[PDB]
Structure formats: C-alpha cells, structure tokens
RNA sequence: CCCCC
RNA sequence: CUAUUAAAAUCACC
RNA sequence: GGGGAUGUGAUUUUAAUAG
RNA sequence: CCCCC
RNA sequence: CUAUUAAAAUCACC
RNA sequence: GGGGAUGUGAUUUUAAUAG
C-alpha cells in the first residue's frame, strides 16, 4: 500500500489511459500492463476526447533545495516574524457529477477579515494538456455546512480571486512586514488551496525598489514587494506554520475556546482564520515576556518610547513637588532604575518576579486590589505600564489602551492586544472599571530651568516662572512645544494617563 | 473514490515542482541538491529493433535506447502545470519518447535538457550525425 | 380524528391503558373501546407498575381569561418594555431508552452570559400521580450538537436550576424593570422549558413591599418582586415575544449575520440568546428613534439630563468667548434652541430633516466627512450628541461612549448600544478614529457673573475674578463644586467631550 | 547489526539526517554512507526546520560507577527499607500525528491515592538542541483505556507535575524514612516516566541540615531532604524494585487477586500502584515475621514499648488477684518470660513452635476456636498480641487494631496492616467478631505498694490505700498520672484491650 | 447472526410461559386475563378434503377443519420447555394437527384443552361419535 | 479511532 | 553450526 | 468528499538469505 | 451513536 | 367537493 | 456475539380510501 492521494485521478471512467497520454505507471490500465511494463497494442487507439479531474490534495512541502527558501518555518522564526501573521482557513466543496474524490476551495478567509468565494475550479486532464477549468461541485453534506449552499452560485473566477488576495495582503502588510506568514490550522486543504494563488522559487528582489519580492505576475514575469504590487496575481514566497503540529487535541474551536471568548462563529473561513491566529498568538505570547527577542522598527517607535519616559519623568516630578507624598511605591519595576532621581522621597521598587538583578532592593509584590487594598495606604503608587485589576485612590497610572489598534498594536488573545514595540508585550484587555478610584490626568507642562532666548506662546497651561510675566522665553516656549508633541504622540499611540483625584495645577504654581 | 496514480517516493519532487514558477530550473536544482529522480514511468516492452527517432507515434527503439510513454516523460505532464510551449500543447503527450539507456535512470530530466534536430527527428548530441 | 402533540404518550409500550387511569379517550387500550365508548372488562387487571413519559411539547398560550395577563405580547409593548428584555434559548436532549418522542431541556442560556445545565427530567405518568423525575436521554445526533455530549454527565437538579434562574434574573433586572420579557427565537421549545421554572396566575403584589410580583415560592406560597426574591424558585408572570413571527425566513444566525458581526458561536444557549436579543433590538430600534415613546426613570436620569445642559451651556459659551467665532454651525439640532441665549455669534441650525419644528430656521443636512468635509470650514461646528463618521477640526463634540455599560446603556446591535434615558436612542459603536482632528476637552469652570461673599477652594481650573485674588468667594466656590459634580456625573454616564486643538483657557483668563 | 529501542527516531520522515547533526551512525541518511563511513556531499544542504521525536523507552540502569548509588536494589534491602515503599504506576498515551513509535506518561499514580495528569510531552530533536515540548498524542485504543480519553483535555505542564510529585513524596515520607523506594510492577514504562522527574548522582547532604539529600532544585543547584524540600522539582536519588522479577506470571491484578480482596479498579494509576505495593508487602512480610531484621526509631516507639509493658504488668496482676485463678495459659509467648515475676498462680507457656528458647518450659501450640475451644477451659488464657480467630471467654486479650493507621502502622495486604515497631509484624484484619465472649477492659490503676507523702487527684479509678482516705498521697498521684499517660499512649497506638465478662474492680478494693 | 423465528406480538406470552412452573395453566390464565392468543403458526394450504383424524403424519382435513404443523401448535414447543409427557417427547412435533375452524383463532390453546379418543384418533367432543 | 470538508 | 530479514504464535506493558 | 494512522518490548518456532 | 457481553 | 392514512419534498426547532 | 433505537412540529404536493 504505497500510493498517495496526490494527483489521484477522480474521473468516473472505469478503464485507465493508453500507454501514451498516461502520467504514471499506475495510470495505465491492466489491459496494457505486461510483466510490470507496458505494451503497445495495435487494436486499442488512444482516447482523443476525455476530461479527467485531478486531485491536487496531499502536497508535501518537505523539499530541501539549495537556493530555495522553505515554506514551513519553525516556531522561533514565526515568533520573530509576527506582524506577518495572517490566519488562513478554507472551506471546500466536493466534486459530484463528472468526477468524485476531490475537494475544491469554495471560500477563502483571512485574519484580515475578508472572505473570497471562488468558482469551483479544478485541473482536468485533456489529451493535449492539463486544463484549469470550472468543474461540477456540491456543498458538503451536513448541517454545519448549510451556509455554503448560497455560496455555490456566488463567487468570482480564480483570476479576480487571486488578484484580490494579493491586493488584500499588500494592503494589510505593506507597513507591518516584508513577508507573509500564513497561520494554518490543518495544512492539507490549505496547501491544496495555496496551489491556486502561490508560486514559489528562489529569493528575488522587487523591481522598482530593493525590498524582498513577495508578489509575482504571470502577465509580465516580474516580481514586486508589498508596496509596488498592483495588478499582481500570485504570492511569491509565503511562509506558513501549522498550529495543529504544536500538540493539540480536538478541533480548532475547542482549543481556542479554552483561552478566548471574544471570537466565535466556527466553520466560517474568516472566523476560523481569526481563531487560528488568536490561538497561535496565545500559544506564543500570552505565557510571559521574552526579552531575548527584539523586533525591527517599522516606524515612529523610538519617538513613542522616548516620549513615554519624558512624560513619566515630568508627571512624577510635578506630582511629587505638588503634594510631597511621604513614600512612592513603584509597583511592577523589573530593574531598580527610578524615574525622578532628584526627589526627596523614599523609593521602593516592587515586582512579583525580580528580573535577575542582584541588587535586590526590589520587593516581591504580585498586586491585586482585593488582597492588597491597604498594602500602601498613604503616598502614591506608580503603576506605569503595569496591569492590575483595580488601582487604588492614591495612584499614578499609565495604562495601555488595547482597543487602539495601530501598526504597533496587533490584535491579541481574549480581547487583549499584542503591543509590538522593540519587544512584543501581550497586554490584557482594557477594562475601564479599574479607574473608578482615579481621574484622567490633564495636559500640563512644568519646568524649573532658568530661561532666556514663531508667535509667542499664549497658553495658560505652561507652568513656568517665565509664564508669570506678560510673555514667555523662547527656551521654555520650544520646550513646551516639544513636550506637547511628545504627549500627543504618547496618547495617540494608546497610552491613557490616570492620576488621583486630588491632583491639580495650583500646587505646581506654588513654586512660582 | 478515484484511482490513485502516484507513489510516495514522488511526493516531494512533484509538490516542489507544482508550486514552482520555473519548474524546469526547479527540477534541475532539486537534482543538483541531492534529490532522487522521478520514479514510476511507463517503460514499453519493446524488442530494441527499429529506427532511433526520438519522438514517434509508435515505439521505435535501438538496442542502446529504451522507449517510454511520452506523457510520462514530460515534467509539465507529471506535475499537471502549464506547458511553456506556444499554444500550451505537450509534444510528448500522445507519443513515444526514446531515452538512451545510460540516461534511462532519469527520463524526466533528459527530455528537459536535450532537444531534437528538426530535419532528422533524433536526439542532438546522442544520435544526430547531421553536423 | 385530529390530535395534537401536547401530552403525547412517549413510552414504548405497544398497548394502551385501562379505562380507569387513562387520562383521555385516545389513551384507552383498544380492548375496551366499543361504539365510541369504553367497556369495563372485569377479567383484565390494571397495570400498577407502569411509567409513561409525557411530552410537554406543543403548549398553546393563547388563552383569554379575565384576571390573567397574557404571556405573549405585541411588539409595541415589547418596545415599550426594553429594559426587561432577557434573551432566552434552550438546547435539548432526546429521550432514548424507555420512551422516544420528546425533547428535554439540557442547557438554558440567557442574554446575560449565564448557561445552566440541568439533568434530563420529564413528567412520567405513574398509576398514582405524575412523577417529575429524571429519565434516560441522549444528546441530539449530528456534529453541531457534539458539544452537548459532555453536558449529560454534568448538570444540576431542576430545583437548584430554577433557584439559580430566579436569582440571576433578579440580580439582572432588580434595578432596571418590574418584569421580565423573554426574547425567544422559536417559542416551541422555550415554552416547553418554561414549564419547568415558570408559573402564571392573576396579578399579585410583592410581600414586604408594593411592587409587581415577579417571583413565586413553593415552600411558602408567597410572591415577591425582583428585590425581595431570595430562595424563590418560580418566575410568576413572565412576558415574552417570539422574534421569528416578525417576518423572518431562515436560521437565527442567518438573520443576525445580516446586521451584526460582533456575536457568533451558534448553538451555545447563551450565545443564541444574545443573538436573539440583538436581532430584536436591531429590528425595533436601529431603524429610527421615536420621540413618541417615553420611559420611566430608573435613577440619576434627571441629574444626567441636567448635567449635560450645565456643561453644554458652559463649553459652548467659553469656546465662543475665547475664540470670537463669527459663525456657528449646529449640526443635528432637532429644535430651534440655542445652548446659550445671548451670543454675538450668528447661529445656524442643521438636522437630518426638520424634527417637529416646521419653521425655516433649521436646515436639513446629512453629514459625513467623505462628502461634507469642506463646506463648514468657517467658524465652529457644534456636534452635540450627533454621531458622524469623522468630525472636522473646528468642532465642539459631545459623543456618547457606547463601550460604557450602565443601568441606562443596554447592549445593542453591531457593537452599538441602546442608551435609554427618557427616550431610547440606539448609538453606533464608539471609535476614537472619529476624533483624529480634535483633542479632549480639559475640565474648567468659567464664571464672569457678579459676586457675593466656607472651605476655601485652592484649585486653579476655576476661571473667575474671585480666583485672581488669594481666596475664592463662597458663591463661586460652591458653584464650582456643583459644576464639578455635574461634569463628573456626565463623564461617568459615558459621555466624551472633544474640542478643537487650538482650544485653551488662556483667552478666558484675559477678558477680565 | 544489532540495535536497541532506546533513543529511537520516532518521526515519520522517510529519509535520514545529514552527517553533521545526526547523533549516531545509524541516523545518517543513506546518501552519505560509504564503506561503513560517511561522506560530506557539498551539494546537499542540511535540514534546519526538522523536529524528530525521540523514544525514551528502553533505559537500562545497570551501571557500576564508584560514587553513584544503584537505583535498582535487591529485595533484602527493600525489605529493610519498608517505611519508604511508595508504589508507582504510569499510564501512557501513544504519539500519533507527526511521530509514531513511542509512549508518553499521561497519568502518574502512587501508593498514596494521588493521581497526577500531565500534558503529553516528549523530547524532540531540533537542529540546535533537544526541545522538551508538547507533542501530538492519542489515548491507547481499546476499552480498558477508555477512561483515559477525558484525561487528554485535562493535564498540567510537567514542571507543575514534578513540583507536586516532590511535594507529595515529601509530605508522605518526611517522618517515615530518609529515602523513597518506588515499588514498580514492570519498570519498562516507569523508567521512561522517571526521566521526567528523577535525577541521579553521587550521594549528597541536605543544605540547612545533615540528612541524606532526596530532592534537587534546578533554579538554584541545591539539594534537600524530605523536610526542607519546598519548591524542589526533582527526586535526587530514588531507589526502586521491580516486583515482576520475583517470579511472577500473568497480570498484576491476576497476582494481587490471589492474596487480597480489598483493592481493585485496575488500570487506574493510583489503584495499580496500591496493588503493586500490596503485592510486594504480601510477598515479603505476610509469610513469617523475622526477628533478625530491626528497624530505626521514628518516634514514640520506645514510649509505646514501655507502655505496653506497664499495662501488661498491671492487668495480668490485677486479673489474678481479683479472681485467684489456679492456672494460667499463656498462648503465643515466644520467650519463657512472665509478665509478673511473683504470682501464686502456676504458669504455662505456649507458642506456635519454640521461638529461640529451646528449653522445654514452652509448648508448641497452633490455636483456633474451631479446634482448640474446650482444652484450656480452666483458669485464664492470656493472649498478649496473638491474633486468633476467636478468643475464649476466660481471656485477657491485647489485640492491635489494624484499622488505626499511624507512623508505625503502614497499610498491608488483604485488609491487614504492617505494624513496624523495632521489628515488622504483619497483623491480619481486625474484626470485632473475635471478641464476642469478652468485654472491653475498663481503665483502672491498682497499687498495693508501701507509701510516702501536689495537685490532689479526685478520680475514683485509682485503686490504692491512699484513696480510701480523703486525699491521695503525692507518690501514688503522680504514679497514677504516669500510668494514665501510658495507657492513653497504648490505646492511641492502636491497641485494644479485652477481658472476661466477670471482671470487676471490686475484688481489687477488697484485699486492702 | 442467526435467523429470527418469533414476532414481537408473541414476546409477552412466550416469556411469561417460559418462566412459568405450570405453563398450561399459565397460558390459560393469560388468556382469561384478556391476553392475545399466540400468533405466527404454520397453516397448511390443503384442499379441505380427507379423513378428519386429529394428529396425522400428512395433512388430513375436513371442510370445517384446518391443518397446522403440529410442532407449531404445542405450547411446550413454542416455549422450548420440558414436555409433561412421559419420556419428554412431543406428540405434535413431527406431525400435522387438525384444529376446527371455529377454534382456529387460537390453536395453541385448543391442543391444551382437548384430547383425542385413542380408538378413533379424532378430537373428543368435536368429531368423535364413539359414545 | 482522530483530524479536515 | 552462526548471523540477518519476513511471518506466525504466546507473554508482559500501554 | 479528503486524509493520517493504528503504540512498547520479550521468547519460541517456521520458512528462507548470507556466512 | 448508546448500553450489555 | 370534504375528511382520513401512506409516501415524498421543502422549511423551522433540537 | 446480544440488543435497543435513531427526536419535535409546520406547509405543499402525489397517489389512493371513505363520505
Ligand atoms: C490664581 C492662579 C493659580 C494664577 C497662577 C497662574 C496664573 C496664570 C498664569 O500666570 C498665566 C496667565 C498670565 C496672564 O498674565 C493672566 C492669565 C494667566 C492664565 C494667569 C491667571 C492667574 O493669575 C493664574 C492662573
Ligand atoms: Mg475552517
Ligand atoms: Mg435558537
Ligand atoms: Mg439554539
Ligand atoms: Mg501496572
Ligand atoms: Mg497500570
Ligand atoms: Zn518595491
Ligand atoms: Zn480568540
Ligand atoms: Zn523658562
Ligand atoms: Zn506535457
Ligand atoms: Zn540532425
Ligand atoms: Zn419586594
Ligand atoms: Zn449582534
Ligand atoms: Zn465670586
Ligand atoms: Zn533538610
Ligand atoms: Zn491488596
Ligand atoms: Zn500512697
Ligand atoms: Zn411439543
Ligand atoms: Zn372415539
């Protein structure tokens, strides 16, 4: 029993082919086979009109060729190449009338959200060539496939379908990555469907630029990256990972529903793709933060994480010199580097796991408001970029709003989001019930430096000794404008700044 | 349902050349990278007497040659992809092909690399003498 | 002879019953039937160990009795009673071993995400009484019901199940309404499942209280409202409405998919109940708001409606004094009412089409940043509770955040929400992408009014002449505290305020 | 060429490996093998994405290294180390999808009723290292393994599993012994399962302490005894003994059923471990007690051995003074030792066969109420720790209650128990039906001794001349308290005292 | 496996008489308590001419009688229990039995209640005239 | 049996 | 006589 | 309709093949 | 499919 | 033309 | 190897049967 379902003839003719016109030794009937070889018989002529459907099912992309990149990649490379993960699931129809024994892609769904319905189209054997033609097909029997019945009469030719595939992938990934990583659940029928819109080869470079070539056109035999691909119909070198090969039991919905409740609607191609990508994101990123893996800069990441530090310093310094708390507690700090050095306040770093720093002044704290309600009663609790269930009243928090989806914030698991800036952190879902004890920190700018040397700054928000007069110096004017831009870039990236309800800008005007 | 045609030894070579842009170069690189040639071809039981024409309508074979079914020796027919021929018609499909015995280990490669002299109808360099 | 499926004898015994101990004439064994009547044959004994399952499917609640309210209500009363809508879906199992022909409630799900599994329990006629007992049952065959297979080994006795049903309904509805309206998709099996946890009767009053009675206890024959129902096990007068009788063809999922993409996970009971309630909300409220129907006052609905006028008067006054806008464009104003009565600006009104003011001061306008971007560039554009795709840069926006769920904001269709304050408005899903040209409005109190002379206010956001000195007068201090409480009430309600990016409180400080 | 099943390449890839990155010569692909050696073919690339499961079945722990103790011990050392016996059985699953040919530990069970389910986890050779990762696995086919099907969806990561293994072993064995002896039925799969939670090495000493090290931590490379092992995850030097190598044919259940009827429920891991330990205990101890082997002192073993002589001296003295028995029959006395040295009674000794006293004062006797009922009717029959089927009416019995489990009484075979105090006695199952002719012995203190003169004892069970007066002297009060503490220690140990029904303390009060 | 012989209408009567001590009295009580007679007997297609002997080796039937297979009309054969006959041999097994048509609704009962005259070989009271 | 449709 | 495959049977483990 | 399979060893024999 | 063997 | 079985199809529920 | 089965209704038609 050494045969494959690959290229299996599914037609309903009972006898095999002629000695010629036959692809393999098993594709010729026993009427011609002779001691394990074939014999031309003068009587029987070769069939000159016939249509035999071929089963493109059972592909095995396990080749090792010297210049050709592998389609299936490891888990570590897939983790390194997030911002290229596109979930992929295909629904299929069975071939019923002229041939029986193969499935055809009817609906192709991606984690972007798009669904593309295609005419059932197979590779039929002709006496001159192999023809890519529409075949007769029926939806699968069963009641969980009854929604595929209206799709058999909708659907575009595969030319338009693959052009729309390339358009959707290039619209999604042109600012995220230089490749596509298809996150599959069971790669058999996904590879069957990829036969239609994927064409692989050696690594090429874009025409019109220098980035990796990801699309290929058959009209003019040229390759392009995600930017320059307009009218291109084939995805050149996709990578892919199967997720069933990560040791799962049961179907995709049963394994996704253990960790996520915000996705559903199984056996729809797009929703199955979203479930697959969410399950992979859970299996690789929800566990813990890995500081050994660093991601490239797609854009404005350095400005964002510099504005975070700038705003953190200004906010903490101004709050402290505004109300002069006895003690602050920096919950969630892995390394004992304090925010404001020139502070007359006793600093206490807290983290449930100390990040291998031998200076162990970091206390051990896994915060929860239900149990740690009076852990710190007076002072302030700096909660910068730390996620707890509820923040106490005397706090200063910078939470990440996971509902603001950006090029840096990808969709995550169970309502959370995978924020990928330098290191990919997986943040749980933003719940506004944690800030019931706090209020939103308003925009303000504070500076102590002496000043001197297009419109002069007319603003009541600039808290400086220069602002008490009728005009302000050109130094704190530009410093104020830079801090305003930094604050706008920080809050536009999804960072929410919350503070205790006692905060006000008057006690900043104490100093002047 | 349906009758199987392929062997498991031929999966990797036939998948890799079905997704390839240029399947001829892909097969040559698969061979140059230590891969095994394409198995499961139709070998005709001829008596090795006859004219040594390369592609014929009937088996015509010498004693140093063998005759296969032509469709079984065309890579584009083995992989069920578009032929690079103008009008997309296989020249070996519907014919018998003559592979020299020393190359008969890998016929699918042979018809990829060699061509016939149009005035003789026999393999250039191996049997053609019209220089 | 016409029959009905109600009280159908589901047992596997081939014979009938004795003339005694048979409930109806169709249940007597054919040995006894003679000339349309029965005959007492003295030799035949009566069975004394039989157990015959009785089908509770086929209830018709179309009675007209004087003192008894109707369970099934028209869609007008259901619209009037929106704060009580609790979706309801039941999955069932099929009695398999000793009786075939009925279905039993296995899993009950509600609009609130509460799934309750019960042991398969039926009504078995015995020779002395009807025994409400556990019977042999199997899950429905198929693949869309293969998740119900682990639920047969789980499950609770029905007394615990209806105790939990009443407890969850009371916790959900005690503050919203004085009744429950079960939103059923197909009432055929939901009426069967209601036989287990629902009573009916004349209208009663809660003991210890004076509210309508919604729960009934069988330990002591007492009735209770949603507040005082502790240990009560029956719902006393539930109302209900079948959504499939609103001119719907196809599945529930097939009809919910046309208007909503947020829910999914069909054939899970709570998910199907959420789908049913969402479809009802879409059919009733998404089309167009009706100012004819009013709603009672739960709580804090008069404080919110006054706070959103205290705020609308202030920010539109301060934004016009601080900027000296020559023209104003009020988009979406249903009435010819100004937010501030006296203003040097010239006012202009717009709405969709004139809302009950047929005077020609209000123009008709359908706004969208794609088509109506550059027409109102001059002056400001006051969008007060008008939901458009993107607001222009010169705007003062108040937009309800539909992600804040409250006693007044019920879940709605397609990620939107049904905000029901006095009148029911269905607001589409909140997105921050509509505020890219604006910033948040900072909290401030502006007062130019005359003054009179006791905790001192030391906040600097209080813009008034009494704050230019050292201490603020008692008149403007308590007025500031009133306005601060009103503003916090408004922003806790779920309203978000946005303003043009050049807004600053400096020009307010200047006119003094 | 002979091979072994250890480290067998279980993957489904048909080819071999490169000359590099192949561990052994049998793993190299046949393209490279030439004349018993390998050849570096430059054109062939090396696979960089492969994942090959490795079979951990077939370990042979028969090494002889100087400083390293042997895991498998002889049955003499296992008998000497009975307080450490922990039975061990593992059920397995079969790797099904990407690799076939190995079994994986699914459920680990111990003699203590602790069943631990683990996720299916194997050792997968990757091109950089061996990854200890979760792999695809299925439960064993058949019906006796159909209870393992729900365990694939349950399960814990292996770090948690071995933390719990060490915690449970430490809680079980910290007071009994300084080592663990795993009692395996068939060590083939138990050795495979031990690869996951067991290390070996030279003999080490606990940190913070001086006891043998039995646990090892991988966070910090520290060793610990059973007391100080908190968060330790590996068992450092376990010993073990295979019971099937004791001349056994057939199943474990087939051999446990011959001697025990208490346990059952085969193919559940903890039940099979209990069966294995019970079979080992039966084979080693049920046959005959050995006075040659002694055991160390856990605690309270010298107090118990002194209390059961303080009591045996008193009740046999008081029962002979209160009744004036002419003759005594000591059944089961191994030595020619009297409980009371001076007595007017004439003494007679019996035992099974003379126990190391070859003098002819002791007779051989096998007692049973069926055959030896009416031979010792005269006088009393002192059964001190001799277990017969039924005691006669004229008896003073001390019988160990085997239903009391303690540090000294370990579970045994067929409902009996292995009481291990100094020497190991296996006592058969306690039954009250052997005491139908007797009653319990009431607590009493008898003293006829001379007297000397401080809390006063006001109990009336103190039979002495100082209690005839108003207050008892300080000499007999503290002696009463000593005897009461000894009696309570004895009856808490699990010893039950019985006496003839005509026993009363009245005659003791009379001689004074 | 195996070929079924019984009908579902005959279960209750055949179970109840298989566990019974006295199966004749049990069948008579089952009939007197409203039960249905034993169905599924072998009725011979005879032409109703011949001598009216009760038990014969071949069908011998009158016009007022019918002939059944005797084994199918013995309660102890229908129930597969011990015959009360001496030496435990069924007298109807291997023969044909003549049931009068008015009793042909229930043959298994008839052979329970009626007996034959040993000198005639026909049913007492129904056809026997040797008084 | 399990997964895919 | 020794070794190597293939098959079968039995036994133990899962 | 499409697949992927059906676990671990031990001991006797039977044919063979090689020496 | 479920139960029994 | 009305009613009663049987069958088939479709639809909704499980 | 042995069984027990394969749920709830609604609407059209088709043949019939009865009136
Ligand atoms: C009481 C209140 C605190 C004091 C401290 C800071 C003062 C403002 C700043 O000086 C900026 C600006 C200067 C102009 O000259 C007058 C207006 C402004 C807004 C001042 C108003 C007022 O005096 C402020 C708010
Ligand atoms: Mg899918
Ligand atoms: Mg429903
Ligand atoms: Mg449902
Ligand atoms: Mg075992
Ligand atoms: Mg076991
Ligand atoms: Zn480019
Ligand atoms: Zn998810
Ligand atoms: Zn300055
Ligand atoms: Zn060809
Ligand atoms: Zn030539
Ligand atoms: Zn009340
Ligand atoms: Zn919805
Ligand atoms: Zn004032
Ligand atoms: Zn220690
Ligand atoms: Zn036992
Ligand atoms: Zn004394
Ligand atoms: Zn008989
Ligand atoms: Zn007669």
Author numbering:
A (entry chain H), C (entry chain B), D (entry chain F): 2 to 454, 465 to 523
B (entry chain G), E (entry chain C): 1 to 131
Relevant lines from the article:
Nsp14 is a bifunctional enzyme that harbors both 3′-to-5′ ExoN and mRNA cap guanine-N7 methyltransferase (N7-MTase) activities. The N-terminal ExoN domain of nsp14 improves RNA synthesis fidelity by removing misincorporated nucleotides or nucleotide analogs from the nascent RNA, whereas the C-terminal N7-MTase domain is involved in the 5′ capping processes of the viral genomic and subgenomic mRNAs.
To obtain a stable nsp10-nsp14-RNA complex, we substituted MgCl2 with CaCl2 in the reconstitution buffer or introduced an ExoN active-site mutation, E191A, to nsp14. (E) Cryo-EM map and atomic model of the tetrameric form of the SARS-CoV-2 nsp10-nsp14-RNA complex. Unless otherwise indicated, we used the tetramer form of the nsp10-nsp14-RNA complexes for subsequent structural analyses of the ExoN active site and its interactions with RNA substrate because of its higher resolution. (C) Active-site structure of the SARS-CoV-2 nsp10-nsp14 (E191A)–RNA complex. Mg2+ ions, green spheres. +1CP, –1CP, and two active-site metal ions are superimposed with their cryo-EM densities contoured at 7σ. The shallow SARS-CoV-2 ExoN substrate binding pocket encompasses only base pairs –1 and –2 of the dsRNA, interacting with the RNA backbone through the A1 of nsp10 and K9, W186, and Q245 in nsp14. At the 3′ end of the dsRNA substrate, nsp14 separates the mismatched C-U pair and flips +1UT out of the RNA double helix.
